[PDB]
Amino acid sequence: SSPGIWQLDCTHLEGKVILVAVHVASGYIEAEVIPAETGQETAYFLLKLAGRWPVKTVHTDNGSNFTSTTVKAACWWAGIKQEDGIPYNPQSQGVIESMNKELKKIIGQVRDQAEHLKTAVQMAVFIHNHKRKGYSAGERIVDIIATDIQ
Amino acid sequence: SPGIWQLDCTHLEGKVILVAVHVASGYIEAEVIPAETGQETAYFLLKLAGRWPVKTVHTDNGSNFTSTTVKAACWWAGIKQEDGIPYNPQSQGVIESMNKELKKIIGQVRDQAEHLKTAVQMAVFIHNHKRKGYSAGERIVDIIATDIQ
Ligand SMILES: COc1ccc(CNC(=O)c2ccccc2CN(C)Cc2cccc(OC)c2C(=O)O)cc1
Ligand SMILES: COc1ccc(CNC(=O)c2ccccc2CN(C)Cc2cccc(OC)c2C(=O)O)cc1
Ligand SMILES: [Cl-]
Ligand SMILES: [Cl-]
Ligand SMILES: [Cl-]
């Protein structure tokens, strides 16, 4: 059910990991900076996400997070269906690749406005979610979910 | 009213829990920090405004109202920074009640995690999903969607 479907995505910058959750139907994102991708960090990130949005399904970003018992436990706790992230639709690869490139571009555009990478990443999340393509991703997610509630 | 949020700072286990409440719905976001500083508050508001359409923030105290770093974050994120004087006296009570409820939920989950931050996010989850009938999470989405249309 597409209002509740999210995709995890892991990218790297400045020797750190940027963990991203994408709301598939809207393109809305949440993101955080962590030193390395672990099951515990991924689990915590998903717990945060599901407290904020009605997360029904998460397509994990790799096999390690799919396998992780801690991630499975977080998904159990938060009522999330944990699924693999095999791109059965080949367009998905491209969309995520394109998103990572866009995010890194925005981070470069703001990078001197903050000392810490985490701040620049949150500026990039802000800009991404507010950009009108006409609706923004932030508007699209709210509309999609509200329509589903009604 | 769809865009109005209130900051709230409470304490547990020698740490600070910073909360943003969406006033019209009761929906919350929260984080654990070692101490409330301008920089931590600024970062928290930047995160919030990237996720929801934040028009106005009523700050939790005079130090965050005064903080140039907080003012800068509000400028950056397009937020109107306001004071938190409870002109409506019922506001005090509502926030006091919310902190008590949150601490109660944290106690109910506290042994399910080592770290306080995990327990706080469990409490955020439970609070936002609780039906009182809609949940706070449903209310915020409905309020904002109605405003967009
Ligand atoms: C989000 O609120 C903002 C408030 C003001 C600005 C304007 N930019 C600068 O003044 C600046 C520019 C370059 C280097 C350092 C600075 C000053 N620092 C303190 C900004 C900063 C604040 C809060 C948390 C932070 O990281 C946790 C950081 C950081 O540096 O990453 C940006 C963001
Ligand atoms: C949200 O994902 C969950 C995964 C599993 C559970 C079930 N509870 C336990 O297994 C447990 C219970 C008590 C003490 C330690 C633990 C094990 N730890 C590792 C849980 C944990 C995971 C991720 C991040 C964490 O903090 C950053 C923590 C933490 O302890 O705070 C809850 C939540
Ligand atoms: Cl990925
Ligand atoms: Cl890694
Ligand atoms: Cl403090």
Is A32:A52 a contact under the CB 8 Å cutoff? Answer: no
CA dist A69 and B126 (Å) reads 22
- Find the CB nearest A78 among B50, B53, B125: B125
What phi, psi does A27 have (nearest 5°)? 80, 5
Sketch the domain layout of chain B as residue ranges.
1-149
Question: Given CB atoms, is B124 within the 8 Å cutoff of chain A?
Answer: yes
Residues 6+ apart with CB under 8 A from A70: A39, A40, A42, A43
- Suggest the residue from B25, B27, B51 to mutate for an interface test with chain A (most A CBs closer than 10 A): B51
Tell me the structure's resolution in angstroms, rounded to a single decimal.
Answer: 1.8
Q: Are A142 and B148 in contact (CB under 8 A)?
A: yes
d(CA A92, ligand 2 centre) in Å:
31
Give residue A18's identity as a one-letter amino acid code. I
Selected from 3.40.50.300, 3.40.50.170, 3.30.420.10, 1.20.1630.10, the CATH number assigned to the domain covering B1-149 reads 3.30.420.10
Sign of the CA dihedral running A81, A88, A135, A148:
negative
Q: Looking at domain A1-150, what is its CATH homologous superfamily? A: Ribonuclease H-like superfamily/Ribonuclease H (3.30.420.10)
Give the Å distances, CA to CA, from B6 to B24, B72, B114, B133.
Answer: 10, 18, 29, 24
Residue B106 Cα to ligand 2 middle (Å):
14
Q: What pairing do the DSSP bridges indicate for beta strands B4-12 and B15-22?
A: antiparallel
CA distance B119 to A38: 19
How many Å apart are CA B47 and CA B72, to the nearest integer? 14
d(CA B18, CA A145): 27
Which among B141, B143, B77 has a CA at the least distance from the CA of A141? B141
